[PDB]
Amino acid sequence: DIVMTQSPDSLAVSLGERATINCKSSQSVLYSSNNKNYLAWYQQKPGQPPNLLIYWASTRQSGVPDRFSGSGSGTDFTLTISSLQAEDVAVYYCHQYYSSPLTFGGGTKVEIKRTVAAPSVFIFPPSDEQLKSGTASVVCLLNNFYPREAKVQWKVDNALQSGNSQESVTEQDSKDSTYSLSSTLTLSKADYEKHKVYACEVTHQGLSSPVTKSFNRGE
Amino acid sequence: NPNANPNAN
Amino acid sequence: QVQLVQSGAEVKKPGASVKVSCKASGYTFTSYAIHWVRQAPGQRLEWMGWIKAGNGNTRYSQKFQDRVTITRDTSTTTAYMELSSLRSEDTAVYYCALLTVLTPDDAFDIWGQGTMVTVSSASTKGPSVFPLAPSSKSTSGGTAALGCLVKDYFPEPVTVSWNSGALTSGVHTFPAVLQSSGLYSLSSVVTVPSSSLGTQTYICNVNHKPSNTKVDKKVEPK
Numbered sequence: 001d002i003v004m005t006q007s008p009d010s011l012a013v014s015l016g017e018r019a020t021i022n023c024k025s026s027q028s029v030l031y032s033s034n035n036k037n038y039l040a041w042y043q044q045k046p047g048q049p050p051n052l053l054i055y056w057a058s059t060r061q062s063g064v065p066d067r068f069s070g071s072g073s074g075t076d077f078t079l080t081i082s083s084l085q086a087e088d089v090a091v092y093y094c095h096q097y098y099s100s101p102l103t104f105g106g107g108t109k110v111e112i113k114r115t116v117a118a119p120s121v122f123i124f125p126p127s128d129e130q131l132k133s134g135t136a137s138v139v140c141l142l143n144n145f146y147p148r149e150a151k152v153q154w155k156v157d158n159a160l161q162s163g164n165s166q167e168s169v170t171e172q173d174s175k176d177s178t179y180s181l182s183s184t185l186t187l188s189k190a191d192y193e194k195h196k197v198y199a200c201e202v203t204h205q206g207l208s209s210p211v212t213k214s215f216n217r218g219e
Numbered sequence: 220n221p222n223a224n225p226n227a228n
Numbered sequence: 229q230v231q232l233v234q235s236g237a238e239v240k241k242p243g244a245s246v247k248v249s250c251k252a253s254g255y256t257f258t259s260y261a262i263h264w265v266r267q268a269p270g271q272r273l274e275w276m277g278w279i280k281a282g283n284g285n286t287r288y289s290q291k292f293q294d295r296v297t298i299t300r301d302t303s304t305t306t307a308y309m310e311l312s313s314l315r316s317e318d319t320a321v322y323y324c325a326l327l328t329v330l331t332p333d334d335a336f337d338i339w340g341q342g343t344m345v346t347v348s349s350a351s352t353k354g355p356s357v358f359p360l361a362p363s364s365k366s367t368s369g370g371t372a373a374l375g376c377l378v379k380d381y382f383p384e385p386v387t388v389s390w391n392s393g394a395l396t397s398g399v400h401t402f403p404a405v406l407q408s409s410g411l412y413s414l415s416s417v418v419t420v421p422s423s424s425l426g427t428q429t430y431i432c433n434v435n436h437k438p439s440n441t442k443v444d445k446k447v448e449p450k
Contacts, residue, residue, distance in 0.1 A: 049323055049339035100222035101289040102275040122366035122373040127358040168402040180400045182415050215365045225261040226329040
């Protein structure tokens with residue numbers, strides 16, 4: 001088969017800078033009868049199908065912005081984004097449609113380098129609907145921050161918690177290049193009702209000291 | 220020659 | 229509008245079979261070939277085969293040892309792909325697509341939304357939906373955060389929209405987490421003006437096709 005290999009596996013550049021992705025094929029993709037390179041580039045954002053950018057190695061499909069261009073011949077090709085925009089966050093794949101089976105590259109994760117942005121912290125107490133089922137989920141939201149690294153600790157009546165929360169961080173945002181994170185603290189209704197103060201303490205590079213959002217179990 | 224993808228002419 | 233619509237996510241037990249559909253519309257069905265490509269979690273796109281919609285000829289990838297079967301129904305302008313003897317490695321998102329339709333006059337490339345298939349002995353379970361209501365404790369700088377908590381479901385995915393797709397800006401549907409129970413959970417949040425909470429309506433639309441579960445939850449202040 002025709003193995004496709006991309007370099008680098010991931011890259012990070014600032015907004016407005018140039019980004020380039022290399023793709024090599026284990027054998028030539030140039031067809032001698034029509035002198036065309038059976039190579040394409042695809043863009044894939046999380047949860048979406050791929051989106052064709054370049055075909056015939058260098059031709060850009062009608063709806064693609066001009067800042068995307070492709071070059072190469074035979075066994076070596078390069079995708080160029082002349083001015084990286086926030087919405088260009090994606091994994092980029094090269095693809096050969098020369099010999100069966102059709103094959104794709106390993107993908108190249110493209111990320112934006114951004115200025116520091118402190119998170120906006122929100123806290124949601126359990127819904128009365130959920131409490132009727134006997135469980136209490138307390139959600140702490142860290143919204144639109146950068147860099148991705150952040151630290152969140154739970155405190156119930158000012159006692160540091162351990163072993164009852166789970167975290168999830170989003171992909172990089174396609175508009176402001178930030179990240180968001182949720183920390184969900186889960187207790188039983190009975191255990192939840194034995195304490196007053198539920199606090200979410202947040203540490204991030206954009207903050208000079210930890211920020212705490214809290215509430216008293218009585219609304 | 221190309222086995223390829225019938226959709227690529 | 230060339231368009232490809234696939235069937236919904238499913239859970240299958242090891243050794244069983246799965247059949248995914250691909251409804252095509254907006255073009256002459258029989259003049260192009262429909263491919264099937266899968267993408268295992270954290271993996272590259274992998275081509276499985278294609279079928280010419282007209283004469284129904286097929287070409288498969290040898291790497292599947294001929295447990296793939298691509299068929300096509302012209303009257304229903306729909307293509308199908310059946311994968312038998314499912315193993316743990318077959319858990320993936322299965323796409324149908326018209327890859328690189330290239331002509332001198334016009335060129336295009338269309339994909340289905342994908343169909344997530346999970347190979348597991350565990351049984352399906354629909355999610356519970358709870359509101360993450362806006363309040364003083366979730367206001368900052370005149371902004372208010374609200375959302376929906378989608379708890380205890382299997383397998384993935386659950387899709388979340390707001391106002392039937394009319395609200396997308398500032399939305400964050402977090403990657404699901406695996407709870408100690410083996411069931412998944414996620415939250416979908418959005419930030420809106422605090423001043424318009426009394427005049428605007430925010431409804432999260434939760435869909436879990438494996439269990440045929442559709443839930444709309446109006447998120448109201450306090």
